[PDB]
Design an enzyme around this catalytic site. Structure first.
Site, PDB file in Angstrom:
ATOM      1  N   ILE A 118       1.199  -1.410  -0.465  1.00  0.00           N
ATOM      2  CA  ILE A 118      -0.134  -0.441   0.372  1.00  0.00           C
ATOM      3  C   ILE A 118       1.100   1.492   0.494  1.00  0.00           C
ATOM      4  CG2 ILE A 118      -1.526   1.247   0.964  1.00  0.00           C
ATOM      5  CD1 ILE A 118      -2.330  -1.576   3.251  1.00  0.00           C
ATOM      6  N   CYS A 119       0.404   1.699  -0.715  1.00  0.00           N
ATOM      7  CA  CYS A 119       1.583   3.299  -1.601  1.00  0.00           C
ATOM      8  C   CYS A 119       0.705   4.498  -0.485  1.00  0.00           C
ATOM      9  CB  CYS A 119       1.062   4.136  -2.692  1.00  0.00           C
ATOM     10  SG  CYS A 119       2.572   5.485  -2.010  1.00  0.00           S
ATOM     11  N   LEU A 120       1.082   4.552   1.122  1.00  0.00           N
ATOM     12  CA  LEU A 120       0.214   5.469   1.797  1.00  0.00           C
ATOM     13  C   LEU A 120       0.913   6.116   2.514  1.00  0.00           C
ATOM     14  CD1 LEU A 120      -2.871   6.973   3.042  1.00  0.00           C
ATOM     15  CD2 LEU A 120      -2.705   4.281   4.715  1.00  0.00           C
TER      16      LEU A 120
END
Lengths: 74, 149
Positions: free
Chosen positions: B86-88
């Site tokens: 996840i890119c967060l």
């Protein structure tokens, strides 16, 4: 022998059920259908991040008084 | 990681005392430092009706380092790749010790409701989200029915 548990609908309200430790997950689904009309084959019951198998009992998962399950319906 | 363990136990206890409506989570086995979590697609989104499983691996420096959170269920999204990564920002540079796994999971739900096309972890899917919402929603609906229901 009978006891009370909570069923939390994702993004929704909390159901209360009277169950026995010997009730199967399938039994619980039938109870949810009694109160809510949701058919069992559209229900998935979750506890602490794990999906509960229809053939096992609450006892098998060590689910006790006032524990909270989660209900996914779609 | 005893201080991490004490804080993990507290988050776990808080989930039990006040179950949130967006997630269910707990240890995989006897190791509190490894959890499994379940979220459902936000209402009225292309992921509606889907159950998505994630892993949570706490560091021993928790809560001063973020937890490693990855999807195990396959999902069509520009900020989540086939490895479930996840890119967060709050999971990397914007982490804070005031954050909890539960709050992080709600942010992931918010990310499903509003993908970020400016952080394209999957460039193709990000282009489609910009170009054609109808097509994007169709693919996201199909992967939900295929892999998450």
């Amino acid at each position: 022998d009978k006891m009370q548990i909570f069923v939390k609908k994702f993004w929704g309200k909390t159901i209360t059920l009277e169950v026995e430790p010997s009730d199967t997950i399938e039994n619980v689904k039938a109870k949810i259908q009694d109160k809510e009309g949701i058919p069992p084959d559209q229900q998935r019951l979750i506890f602490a991040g794990k999906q509960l198998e229809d053939g096992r009992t609450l006892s098998d998962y060590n689910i006790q008084k006032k524990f909270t399950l989660y209900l996914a319906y779609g | 990681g005893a201080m991490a363990l004490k804080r993990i136990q507290k988050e776990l206890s808080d989930l039990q005392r006040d179950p949130p409506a967006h997630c269910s989570a707990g240890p995989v086995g006897d190791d509190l430092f490894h959890w499994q979590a379940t979220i459902m697609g936000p209402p009225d989104s292309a992921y509606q009706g889907g159950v998505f499983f994630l892993t949570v691996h706490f560091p021993t420096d928790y809560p001063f380092k973020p937890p490693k959170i990855a999807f195990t269920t396959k999902i069509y999204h520009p900020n989540i790749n086939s490895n479930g990564s996840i890119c967060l920002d709050i999971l990397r540079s914007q982490w804070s010790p005031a954050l909890t796994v539960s709050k992080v999971l709600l942010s992931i739900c918010s990310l499903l409701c509003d993908p970020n096309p400016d952080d394209p972890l999957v460039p193709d899917i990000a282009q489609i989200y910009k170009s054609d919402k109808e097509k994007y929603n169709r693919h996201a609906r199909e992967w939900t029915q295929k892999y998450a229901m």
